[PDB]
Amino acid sequence: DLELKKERRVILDCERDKVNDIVDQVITIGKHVKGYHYIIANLGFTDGD
Amino acid sequence: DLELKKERRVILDCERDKVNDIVDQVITIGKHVKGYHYIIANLGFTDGD
Ligand SMILES: *[C@@H]1O[C@H](CO)[C@@H](O[C@@H]2O[C@H](CO)[C@@H](O)[C@H](O)[C@H]2NC(C)=O)[C@H](O)[C@H]1NC(C)=O
Ligand SMILES: *[C@@H]1O[C@H](CO)[C@@H](O[C@@H]2O[C@H](CO)[C@@H](O)[C@H](O)[C@H]2NC(C)=O)[C@H](O)[C@H]1NC(C)=O
């Protein structure tokens, strides 16, 4: 559904557990190549993997 | 080095252990989007993940 408007820019506002799950599902579906842009909206940016 | 000739088509001839490692490194560097082609050259195609 996020490809209906051809979205290139995603802001993730989750805690230290859901950020890892969303990143793992992005890597599984393959949406981390150059052309995309993500912002992990938290204070512990290096707390995730 | 495989992006010097802009290679789109890779044939992997490895056993049941190295195929999983090469696929994991392809997923880590992000080369499994639409546009690339792969052939797992073995008899146990469904033996890997
Ligand atoms: C980082 O992600 C952003 C968003 O996709 C992109 O930044 C663009 O970088 C180019 C090259 O300097 C600029 O000309 C554009 O103005 C930037 N903003 C856009 C397209 O909104 C780019 O894809 C990524 N890389 C860099 C180096 O910025
Ligand atoms: C994914 O599968 C498609 C369809 O099976 C392949 O697309 C080929 O594209 C060429 C060039 O447009 C056309 O001859 C046909 O649309 C397809 N060829 C066939 C069916 O023999 C594509 O090569 C595959 N691999 C990718 C995208 O990496």
UniProtKB/Swiss-Prot annotation, chains A, B:
Name by which UniProt lists this protein: Glutamate receptor 2
Assembly with partners or alone: Homotetramer or heterotetramer of pore-forming glutamate receptor subunits. Tetramers may be formed by the dimerization of dimers. May interact with MPP4. Forms a ternary complex with GRIP1 and CSPG4. Interacts with ATAD1 in an ATP-dependent manner. ATAD1-catalyzed ATP hydrolysis disrupts binding to ATAD1 and to GRIP1 and leads to AMPAR complex disassembly. Interacts with GRIP2. Interacts with GRIP1. Interacts with NSF via its C-terminus. Interacts with CACNG2, PICK1 and GRIP2. Interacts with GRIA1 and SYNDIG1. Part of a complex containing GRIA2, NSF and NAPA and/or NAPB.
Gene: Gria2
Span within the parent record: 198 to 246 of 883
More details: The postsynaptic actions of L-glutamate are mediated by a variety of receptors that are named according to their selective agonists. This receptor binds AMPA (quisqualate) > L-glutamate > kainate.
Induction of expression: Down-regulated in the pyramidal cell layer of CA1 in the hippocampus by global ischemia.
Originating species: Rattus norvegicus
Entry function: Ionotropic glutamate receptor that functions as a ligand-gated cation channel, gated by L-glutamate and glutamatergic agonists such as alpha-amino-3-hydroxy-5-methyl-4-isoxazolepropionic acid (AMPA), quisqualic acid, and kainic acid. L-glutamate acts as an excitatory neurotransmitter at many synapses in the central nervous system and plays an important role in fast excitatory synaptic transmission.
Membership in a protein family: Belongs to the glutamate-gated ion channel (TC 1.A.10.1) family. GRIA2 subfamily.
Species lineage: Eukaryota, Metazoa, Chordata, Craniata, Vertebrata
Expressed in which tissues: Detected in forebrain. Detected in dendrites of neuronal cells. Expressed in the pyramidal cell layers of CA1 and CA3 and in the granule cell layer of the dentate gyrus.
Cellular location(s): Cell membrane; Postsynaptic cell membrane; Postsynaptic density membrane
Annotated domain remarks: The M4 transmembrane segment mediates tetramerization and is required for cell surface expression.
PTMs per UniProt: Palmitoylated. Depalmitoylated upon L-glutamate stimulation. Ubiquitinated by RNF167, leading to its degradation.
